[PDB]
Design a protein around this ligand. Structure first.
Ligand SMILES: Nc1ncnc2c1ncn2[C@@H]1O[C@H](CSCC[C@H](N)C(=O)O)[C@@H](O)[C@H]1O
Length: 221
RNA sequence: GAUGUGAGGCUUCGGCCUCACCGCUCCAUGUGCGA
């Protein structure tokens, strides 16, 4: 059971080809020379694809599962500050325990990637945990920064609801649905000033054809 | 990625309801690891 979406063979079935269709949708100019945080990086195949070809000055992959982070560090050699010096991995839970911790975050990134993560944060920590993540992302971005959001649809949550009693409990308490993420992220509770639907990448499975959004943090104060 | 069967009833023929049955799991999946 992978109650956080912490699958240890994830890319083997997401990208059987080994070609991640999201790389045709993400734009190189978003990353080149920028500080990037990759949330829920798993074993880091996508993290390392970006770090080794699109030259971010700093790329940080974060995952709650230390086993996947160790794997990600061992995957660096498959992609051989220029890469590999521009990438680091960290084990951690991005969802913060208190709203006081979430509003003390200082800006450090030009880009935050939040790809295929919202469902797992939502199921494990409820609306409250998802909103803490959203507010923390905004606080962690510099003016002019961007959030790249790839959220799972609500229709795909239900088949995971029995993983744990807490997940089950959260499933039936959730009131902020994916269809309302955009409005929430651009409300004063978070503060993103505009957003765009970039595209829906192609994938062998329709279940992985998810919209990719760009949320902009305004350059002016 | 994958929810089957039957009787009765209501259908706005799109299905739905009650009950009975069958299940409550199977399949896909490693660029990590080598006691
Ligand atoms: N609260 C949390 N903090 C950090 N990582 C988390 C998390 N909740 C779930 N995760 C991690 O999120 C990952 C989702 S797999 C998604 C991988 C990657 N973002 C991609 O799109 O290809 C899992 O590896 C899981 O361990």
């Amino acid at each position: 059971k992978f109650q956080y979406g912490n699958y240890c063979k994830y890319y083997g079935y997401r990208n059987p080809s080994c070609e991640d269709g999201r790389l045709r949708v993400l734009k190189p100019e978003w990353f080149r020379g920028r500080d990037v945080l990759d949330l829920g990086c798993n074993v880091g195949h996508l993290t390392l694809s970006i770090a080794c070809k699109w030259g971010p000055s700093r790329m940080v992959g974060l995952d709650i599962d230390s086993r996947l982070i160790h794997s990600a560090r061992q995957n660096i050699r498959h992609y051989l500050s220029v890469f590999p010096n521009n990438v680091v991995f960290v084990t951690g839970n991005y969802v913060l325990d208190r709203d006081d911790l979430v509003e003390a975050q200082t800006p450090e990134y030009d880009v935050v990637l939040c790809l295929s993560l919202t469902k797992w944060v939502h199921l494990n920590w409820g609306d409250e945990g998802l909103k803490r993540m959203f507010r923390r992302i905004y606080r962690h971005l510099r003016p002019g920064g961007i959030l790249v959001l790839e959220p799972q649809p609500w229709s795909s949550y239900g088949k995971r609801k029995t993983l744990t009693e807490t997940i089950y409990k959260n499933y039936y308490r959730i009131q902020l649905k994916p269809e309302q993420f955009s409005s929430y992220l651009t409300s004063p509770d978070v503060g993103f000033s505009s957003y765009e639907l970039v595209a829906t990448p192609h994938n062998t499975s329709k279940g992985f054809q998810r919209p990719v959004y760009l949320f902009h943090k305004a350059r002016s104060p």
